């Protein structure tokens, strides 16, 4: 008659958790684990203590050129990395193009931190305008200008030529910021610098730029014809920077010491600040995940998990499940 | 599959077993009782884990796109960049999901091959002492008392002291 | 292969089968014949078909390159792209040519498991109703009709309907 | 004496289908699937109801600025993608350059029709002459020119200063293209536009450009000397474009409307047109293939294969013949 | 490993054994000594060569890096290119490494199957002629010479030519 | 009693070489095969036959124009490869800029063979002095110069306007190099090419260039606010190069015969020659190696195993050890 029995078996459970391999879909296992992130808060944070630097309606330039709609930032504090919207609307005020902007940028985003200086002060000016103002460029109802650049227009009826000069020397590089002004007729440019053929020399331990301003009708662009065409450099400490002009120059008045470099970015995102803090951003938010991936976006900055487009990332760590 | 194990010859997972991965149903005359086997449970947990451990260490040194702007001419240059971060962005996401993929029907084969081998070493240490059902269990030829049964999970089953007791068992049925 | 089923035990496949992939040859009072399995085969063209479209479907979102003009004054670019297409080429050429070499042999080893596991599917159910062979046949101690025969295939096989039929075959040559 | 038998077995066939394994080579299955394509048409296609835009031995600098041998292409169909040979021969009949070519070249790759416009009559220059020419620029035997740009030189004696304009009331952008003469002497120069002293001025809202003409000796390509520098521009819809010039100006006949953008290329084939239609066209022949794969070239447009180097890809899909 | 010879049910290798991979201890009347099995060691030894070869030759095709400067305004396409080589260097580094790991333990559980394939040769020819000790040994119900262990070794023996001398044996152990 | 046994065994031996799995870490097998090269020579050696071009303290520009500290480099043999150092004392010895370097160096990456050959005497100079000299370009303790360019100054109170021409008779293709002066103020002009306002033309089949001399105050370097630039063509076998000048002009000496076309590079490196041989050279060292990896360097040169980041590469080819 039946005797004593030994069986071998294995676990089972009520678990739903399915995962995929080459062969079979959607197979029900004990034990999985999800590797893969898929939520995010929404918001933009400070990364570890930093906070970022949140532009509004501002673009780089607006801001490092001081465009009046971007008072907010004359002097901002260190940054962890920064924020820019897709289409600023407070970009330059005044029509015209930034020379190697992208470079600019590119070089921002290796920068946490600028102190802005005054180079040269507006009471410096005693031969010529320094109240260059314009329409496009307007600060409460009235017409303004730039903060950080300076319109030097004849005084009386005379534009003596400017030579100035500047030395770093402060032990940190200098970014320097300056313009010329392309008028549309010649009229304009006596009316602005007396003047009819003018130039600007800019002179550095690397640069030797000659600029001429280029006198043509153009298409209205916020009812000016005008343009204002903008130039940068880095000029290392110790270097100095020479400027001789005739005319059309829009001079520099405060210039941006490079107080930190690090791992930065320049985030494209529509967000705004979320009063948070995160080890982790993506410009549609940030990630507090021990998962080793994410499918959130591909930009993102910080101590982030490995991005993959995928929308499942299932490993199955037990064994198939018996129905 | 691979086996005939798993959902194969014991019909099943055990439910009630909650202990372990892989174990026992015993059944004697001191009713009955599940016990996990910790030989093959914790050697499977390791290496499993050891598995998810290494994949993912496998993957921290992977491509990081980076937004890189461009004006409107260099078309030809941002065309680039943006084929070579998709690139690189594709071919991980490859490698993630096609390492999963085939680590998980491994995994899944890993389960199954420690049932046949946990079945195999008790069907090698009973022998002609037990008759084999073929739905995972075995009938003994003798009486094994819930510590005789404790011989039988670490493998230091004493096989003549029942020879004779199941020797006879089966002269008495095939006679 | 995996263990030695498929050119292993059973030396040889069947050219006169020709319903499916694994099946049985039965021999009894009512001829001979060969007889497909019908679920394990389905099972196995299922997973031989969704691992094809796995592999194609893997590789849809792959690298695609585009000719870009570049001037006499932009030759570290154009090597810059021309290594990044090529690049790129040949890492999904590797990947290609990887993943089917790596699907090949498992789809063979696959095969070679579907057979093994038929096989301790029948053995379990005839167990010492029948003499194994060893060339992947069993020979019946009893005998079994066309409709006997269709019991082991799919599993309706009752044992103890010839167990004694079969017990007194092994004890009169044994007699 | 022996009874009852059954077996267990598999199939087998008199298939020579081989495969590959990381282990084995040349192993004969009894089912394959071959998952690469390797054969094409030899031939240029329409692609879907397409027909492509085949420049014969014309370039896109020859088509887009009317190189007389290519009058051809004066006014193009819609095109699926353009075919141009390695090296074509009606380039810029008279000598000279393309500036920001490949990125025009680029621009192009997104473009599947243009309609051509008048925008500047070659009449409507009285006070100076529109019909330079050159040998370099053969039509019908005589001396001609490129047809979608004007070369102007003095009339009587005088070349007076032009302001001329142009409003895009188009709804699509315009390619506008112009270009510059580069004479050899002061002596030529005087001969062709008076002034010794000349410039051109290009506006639009984002376009602010000063040609001035570069007067040196060069080597002789076409028996000439002197060099033709041509320049493009988008228009957008509603913007205006203003040139100024006294002189070496080469001005607009003839522009392109932006009708329709798209997936396009710019092959590089010797092929010609072979009446035949493909959903997937490669530089060097079509392809009508359900493999997920293909080895025929790396540059195709369509819905195509994807590309490896392989020289065979097989799946196993049965098992391992038996003897 | 993923079948439970290799450190398995048959415990421990064959130091004494150097003349290959797999192989066979037997002790009769005519000593003791060790055999390696010729056929299955070749075979092994072919795939194992042919695995080795594979890897490398995939990898011939493999990214290769150039030294591209670029000025101080050419710092974004500066890094383009370091994250593409760069890039490339990490994805073959992964592929370079995760195909060895892969293929070592395939390469461990292909050695762990030839064990199991060796061992299922055997017990298919000796049957209910021999004892399965459980310890990957088998004790014969006849005397066998040098001839019928070599016999065994090529697939060549012969079962009932043993079948009724064996049947004795196991009744006297009834008896 | 006990009669025949038979047993199923495998492989062992006294081996201790460990390799990796998904699954297990430092398993020992019986038999392993390492496949990654972990060790370089640590010098610099030929390649092939072929000795490299090894730069000491000087940098391509500084070889190509002359430096006069460079002239150990004045008539170099055929070279396999360029080494250079990473920040080389003697580059542009007058301050200043070479255009478009990255470019012409990464055209030197596929020379091997230079035969430098003189397009102007030094004696040709009747109507111009030709013999301007700098302390920044030292020599010998005494101011001196580049040796392959020439600067003219005035001569008498003159400056001539220069016409000189050169056809490229040659079978090979001709690198040729030229510069012009920036000096500080007006005064320096007039002091040296007597003539205020001035041009250099460049003319060629594919060049047009027009330079003119920026004029402006600049940080001293060296001591000096005077600035050179230097330009550079490919002049192809059977075209000419045109030069007109009426000052500040740095005109052609020596150009180089573009004489073997190869494989080559321009190593980074601070090693020197070790007098050793390899066909496999890394910027720290040579590779003699039969494995298929190798982790020494990415930049390599010769025929070389494949690079990667690993520590160790090891493939189990036998079986797992019995302890
Ligand atoms: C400074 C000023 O008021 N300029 C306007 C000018 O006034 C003359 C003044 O410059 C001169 O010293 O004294 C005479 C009398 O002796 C005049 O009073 O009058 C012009 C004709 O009406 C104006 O042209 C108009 O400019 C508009 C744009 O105006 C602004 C602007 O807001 O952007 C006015 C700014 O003050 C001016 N800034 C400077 C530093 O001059 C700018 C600037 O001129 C342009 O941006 C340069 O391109 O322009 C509209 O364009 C309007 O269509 C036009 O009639 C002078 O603006
Ligand atoms: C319009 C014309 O025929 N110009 C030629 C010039 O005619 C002069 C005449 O107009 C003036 O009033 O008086 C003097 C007599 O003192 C001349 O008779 O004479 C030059 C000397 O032969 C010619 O130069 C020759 O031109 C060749 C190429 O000619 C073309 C050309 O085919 O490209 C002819 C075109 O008619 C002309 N087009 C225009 C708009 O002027 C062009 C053009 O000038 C140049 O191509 C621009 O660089 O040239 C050879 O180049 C030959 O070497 C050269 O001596 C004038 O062509
Ligand atoms: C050749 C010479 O003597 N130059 C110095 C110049 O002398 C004048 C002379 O040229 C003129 O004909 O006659 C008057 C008197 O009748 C003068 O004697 O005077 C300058 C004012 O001091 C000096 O400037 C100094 O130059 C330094 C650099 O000198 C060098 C140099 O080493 O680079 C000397 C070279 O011989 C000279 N080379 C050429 C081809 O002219 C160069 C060259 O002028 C500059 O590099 C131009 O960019 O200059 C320092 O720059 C110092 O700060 C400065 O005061 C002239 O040395
Ligand atoms: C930029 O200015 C510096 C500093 O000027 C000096 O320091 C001030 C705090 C004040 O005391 C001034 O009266 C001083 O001149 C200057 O660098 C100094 O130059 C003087 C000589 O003029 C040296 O004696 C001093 O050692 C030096 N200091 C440092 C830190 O280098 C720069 O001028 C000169 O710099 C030296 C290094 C040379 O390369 C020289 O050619 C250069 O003119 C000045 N930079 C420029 C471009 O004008
Ligand atoms: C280009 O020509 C068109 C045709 O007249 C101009 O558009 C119209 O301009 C008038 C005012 O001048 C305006 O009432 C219409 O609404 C406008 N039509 C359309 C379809 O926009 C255009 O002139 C002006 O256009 C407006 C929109 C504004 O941007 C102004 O700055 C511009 O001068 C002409 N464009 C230029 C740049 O001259
Ligand atoms: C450079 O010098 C050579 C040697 O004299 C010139 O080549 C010869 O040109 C003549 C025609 O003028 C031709 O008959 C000869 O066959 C040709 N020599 C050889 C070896 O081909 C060359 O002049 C001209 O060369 C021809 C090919 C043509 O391209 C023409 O435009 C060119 O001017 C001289 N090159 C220059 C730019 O002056
Ligand atoms: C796998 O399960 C998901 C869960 O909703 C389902 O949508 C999908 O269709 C399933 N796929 C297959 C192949 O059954
Ligand atoms: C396998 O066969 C093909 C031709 O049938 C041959 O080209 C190839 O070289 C063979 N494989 C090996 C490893 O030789």
């Known amino acids: ?323 | 599959g691979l086996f005939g194990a798993i959902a194969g010859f014991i019909e099943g997972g055990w439910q009630g077993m909650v202990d372990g991965w892989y174990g026992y149903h015993h059944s004697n005359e001191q009713g009955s009782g599940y016990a996990a086997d910790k030989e093959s449970t914790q050697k499977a947990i390791d290496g499993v884990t050891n598995k998810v451990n290494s994949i993912i260490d496998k993957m921290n040194t992977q491509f990081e796109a980076v937004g890189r702007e461009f004006n409107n001419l260099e078309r030809r240059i941002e065309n680039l960049n943006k084929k070579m971060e998709d690139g690189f962005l594709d071919v991980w996401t490859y490698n993630a999901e096609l390492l999963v993929l085939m680590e998980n029907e491994r995994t899944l084969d890993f389960h199954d091959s420690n049932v046949k081998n946990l079945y195999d070493k008790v069907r090698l240490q009973l022998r002609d002492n037990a008759k084999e059902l073929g739905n995972g269990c075995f009938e003994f030829y003798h009486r094994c008392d819930n510590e005789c049964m404790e011989s039988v999970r670490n493998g230091t089953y004493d096989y003549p002291q029942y020879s004779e007791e199941a020797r006879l068992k089966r002269e008495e049925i095939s006679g």
């Open chain 1, 1 to 323: 008659d039946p005797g004593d029995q030994i069986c071998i078996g294995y676990h089972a459970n009520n678990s739903t958790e399915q995962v995929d391999t080459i062969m079979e879909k959607n197979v029900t296992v004990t034990h999985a684990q999800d590797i893969l992130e898929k939520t995010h808060n929404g918001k933009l944070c400070n990364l570890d203590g930093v906070k970022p630097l949140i532009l509004r309606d501002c673009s780089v330039a607006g801001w490092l050129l001081g465009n009046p709609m971007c008072d907010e930032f004359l002097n901002v504090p260190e940054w962890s990395y920064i924020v820019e919207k897709i289409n600023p609307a407070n970009d330059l005020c005044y029509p015209g193009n930034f020379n190697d902007y992208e470079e600019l940028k590119h070089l921002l985003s290796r920068i946490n931190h600028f102190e802005k200086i005054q180079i040269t002060p507006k009471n410096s000016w005693s031969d010529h305008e320094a109240s260059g103002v314009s329409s496009a460029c307007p600060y409460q109802g009235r017409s303004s200008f730039f903060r950080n650049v300076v319109w030097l227009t004849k005084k009386d009826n005379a534009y003596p030529t400017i030579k100035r000069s500047y030395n770093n020397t402060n032990q940190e590089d200098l970014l320097v910021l300056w313009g010329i002004h392309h008028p549309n007729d010649a009229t304009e440019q006596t009316r602005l610098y007396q003047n009819p053929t003018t130039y600007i020399s800019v002179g550095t331990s690397t640069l030797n730029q000659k600029l001429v301003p280029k006198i043509a009708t153009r298409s209205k662009v916020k009812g000016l014809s005008g343009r204002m065409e903008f130039f940068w450099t880095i000029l290392k400490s110790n270097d100095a920077i020479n400027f001789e002009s005739n005319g059309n120059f829009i001079a520099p008045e405060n210039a941006y010491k490079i107080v930190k470099k690090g791992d930065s970015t320049i985030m494209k995102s529509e967000l705004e600040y979320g009063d948070c803090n995160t080890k982790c951003q993506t410009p549609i938010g940030a990630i507090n995940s021990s998962m080793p991936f994410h499918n959130i976006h591909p930009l993102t900055i910080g101590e982030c998990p490995k991005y993959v487009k995928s929308n499942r990332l299932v490993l199955a760590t037990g064994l198939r499940n018996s129905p």
